[PDB]
């Protein structure tokens with residue numbers, strides 16, 4: 001954990017400073033409340049098992065930010081290919097992520113930092 | 128609370144200045160009495176959970192006035208989007224808020240200061 005990494009003189013990851021796996025679980029749950037109540041986005045998840053998705057997305061986000069847990073889901077490009085997702089849709093999703101993070105009390109400088117890991121992903125996500 | 132924040136040498140916020148979460152609860156309560164009695168605004172709130180709206184609006188105001196807790200609701204543009212709210216409507220709402228702050232005993236200078244935090248939010252709301 002964070003304690004073990006500190007004794008190895010490893011720098012503190014984004015994962016660690018926001019609160020590890022438990023913090024990410026709570027953010028992702030609020031994230032999807034937001035995304036599904038947005039009628040610009042809801043129709044994308046019409047045939048989606050949401051419990052399974054939040055499972056994979058907690059895994060993906062935790063790995064992207066420095067966590068030790070493996071991502072067990074499918075490649076980003078493969079999943080989002082041909083779903084008609086534009087940059088408008090990506091930006092709206094990204095916006096709900098920032099909103100979720102803000103609501104969990106994450107400092108805004110750290111949120112900007114997370115958006116910087118996330119923004120490049122649009123290349124695989126969008127059409 | 129305010130006592131904790133003064134021992135951390137945080138300057139006094141509008142939130143703590145006007146009386147904290149409890150004082151804003153009382154203001155927002157009287158605020159929507161004024162809004163729902165105004166014929167120019169009443170119809171927007173037909174079929175809305177007022178209890179739930181109150182909770183979110185207290186949370187918003189508290190955070191806009193420099194309080195300790197994050198706003199956890201929806202952004203101002205998204206929530207008010209597609210509702211046809213005009214500057215005339217926003218101004219009536221801000222006037223009702225000013226009048227509730229007055230009734231609560233908040234000094235004129237601090238209401239003016241609160242309206243300076245609020246007024247810019249019209250870009251999003253309208």
Ligand code: HEM
Pocket residue numbers: 041044045047048049053056057060072073074075079080085089090091093094118121125
């Ligand atoms: C912001 C960057 C994004 C990340 C990090 C992300 C992450 C993920 C992950 C981990 C999965 C699960 C893959 C699997 O099942 O193996 C997934 C699936 C999915 N994504 Fe995203 N995603 C992003 C953006 C978007 C956007 C912008 C949309 C459209 C608005 C979208 C729509 C979907 C849908 C509908 C599924 C599930 C399909 C299904 O199985 O029903 N994603 N995403």
Ligand code: HEM
Pocket residue numbers: 168171172174175176180183184187199200201202206207212216217218220221245248252
């Ligand atoms: C003074 C600036 C204003 C602030 C700070 C404000 C704040 C808020 C907040 C926090 C919410 C709830 C967001 C959520 O559910 O997550 C909301 C919703 C709403 N507001 Fe405002 N608002 C303002 C001005 C106005 C104006 C001018 C109108 C119309 C005349 C209006 C009418 C509404 C309506 C109809 C809702 C939706 C309630 C529902 O969920 O059905 N607000 N507002």
Ligand SMILES: [C-]#N
Pocket residue numbers: 057
């Ligand atoms: C993926 N949402």
Ligand SMILES: [C-]#N
Pocket residue numbers: 180184
């Ligand atoms: C909300 N008013």
Ligand code: NA
Pocket residue numbers: 209210
């Ligand atoms: Na509409």
